[PDB]
Scaffold this active site. Structure first.
Site, PDB file in Angstrom:
ATOM      1  CB  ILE A   1       8.835   1.715   3.073  1.00  0.00           C
ATOM      2  CG1 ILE A   1       8.472   2.278   4.445  1.00  0.00           C
ATOM      3  CG2 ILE A   1      10.340   1.739   2.839  1.00  0.00           C
ATOM      4  CD1 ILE A   1       9.095   1.510   5.583  1.00  0.00           C
TER       5      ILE A   1
ATOM      6  N   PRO B   1       1.546  -1.155   3.770  1.00  0.00           N
ATOM      7  CG  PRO B   1       1.500  -1.564   1.436  1.00  0.00           C
ATOM      8  CD  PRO B   1       1.701  -2.233   2.777  1.00  0.00           C
TER       9      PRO B   1
ATOM     10  CE  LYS C   1       6.199  -2.484   0.187  1.00  0.00           C
ATOM     11  NZ  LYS C   1       7.208  -1.937   1.125  1.00  0.00           N
TER      12      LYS C   1
END
Ligand code: NA
Ligand code: NA
Ligand code: NA
Ligand code: NA
Ligand code: NA
Ligand code: NA
Lengths: 117, 117, 117
Positions: free
Chosen positions: C64, C1, C32
Site C-alpha cells: 500500500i 509488503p 515498512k
C-alpha cells in the site's frame, strides 16, 4: 512480456525446452522481440480447473500496451491456445489465460525502472 | 474464480484433496459455481509471513464482479480463513489473502476472451 | 509488503535464510516494519529471462502507498538489485522486478480486510 505458466503436469510431462519455445511463440503473437520475453514455468503443482483435477495449465501474460483490449486479447488467446494445447497435449477445456497490462513505472530493470530507460 | 495458494508446508502436510475441497468452498463463499472455480496450490516453498518462517500460507483470489468491495471482501475473508485454518492446521496469524478484481477482456478461454462468450 | 521471488536456481543454490534476510532488506528499502513483510521464494523453476535460460530471478513487490511512483520505484529497484545480485550471485541482466500497488480492501487479514483494522 512476462509469461507465467502453472501446471499440474509433472516436470517429466512438460516437453524439454518449452520455456525457450514459449519465448519465440510470444514474440510472434505479441509483436515484441523474443529477447524481451520472460517465461516462468511451475510444474508438478496441485490444480483444479473448472472444478476438475485432470491435467491442466494456467498462463498469465503481462506486457506494456498490447494486452489491454478485448479484440487483440481474443487474437492473442487463439494463438497461445494453439501453442499450449499442442505442446502440453491438453484439450482447450484444460487451459485458461489471464492478461495483465503493465506501465513503465512498474518494471524494475538494471536497478532503475523502465520510465527512465 | 481463480485461487492460488502458496505454502511452506511440504506437500505431505497439505491434506489430500485440498484443491477439490477449495473449489466447493469458493463456490459457496463467492456465489459462483464450483465448476467455474480454478485452484492452484504450490507447497514446499520457502516463506516468511509477518517476518517469521513458521508454517504459513498466502491465498490470492481473482474474479469478475464479486471481490471489489471492502464489505463483501470482509465476508469472503472470514469464510476463507475458517476453511484454511482448519484444513492446513494453521492459526489465523499465519494466513493472508489478496483479492484481485478481473474484467471479461482479461480472461482467455477456449481460444478467445470472455467478452465474446 | 508482499514479495514473491521465482528462480531457476535449484533450492541448494539459494542461500539458506534468504527469505528472512529479504524481510530485513524490504523493511529498510520500503520503510515498512520487517514484521509486516511477507516473502515467498519458489526455486527450481524452468525460466527464460530476456529469451535466455541461464540462471535468473523475478521479484514481484506489492504494498500500500509506497510502490506507485516511478521516482520511488527507481530507488526501490536500485536497492533490491544490490541485495539480489549479491545474495543469488546473479548479474543485473538476470533479474527483473514488477511493482504492484495494493489498496486496504484487497488485503485479507485475521478474517476481515485491512479497511476495518
Ligand atoms: Na504475467
Ligand atoms: Na496476436
Ligand atoms: Na488469484
Ligand atoms: Na462471502
Ligand atoms: Na508481490
Ligand atoms: Na527505497
Amino acid at each position: 512480456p512476462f509469461l507465467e505458466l502453472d501446471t499440474n503436469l509433472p516436470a517429466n510431462r512438460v516437453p524439454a525446452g518449452l520455456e525457450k519455445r514459449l519465448c519465440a511463440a510470444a514474440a510472434s503473437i505479441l509483436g515484441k522481440p523474443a529477447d524481451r520475453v520472460n517465461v516462468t514455468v511451475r510444474p508438478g503443482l496441485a490444480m483444479a480447473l473448472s472444478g476438475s483435477t485432470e491435467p491442466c495449465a494456467q498462463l498469465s501474460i503481462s506486457s506494456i500496451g498490447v494486452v489491454g483490449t478485448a479484440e487483440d486479447n481474443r487474437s492473442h488467446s487463439a494463438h497461445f491456445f494453439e501453442f499450449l494445447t499442442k505442446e502440453l497435449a491438453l484439450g482447450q477445456d484444460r487451459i485458461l489465460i489471464r492478461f495483465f497490462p503493465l506501465e513503465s513505472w512498474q518494471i524494475g530493470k538494471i536497478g532503475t525502472v523502465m520510465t527512465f530507460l
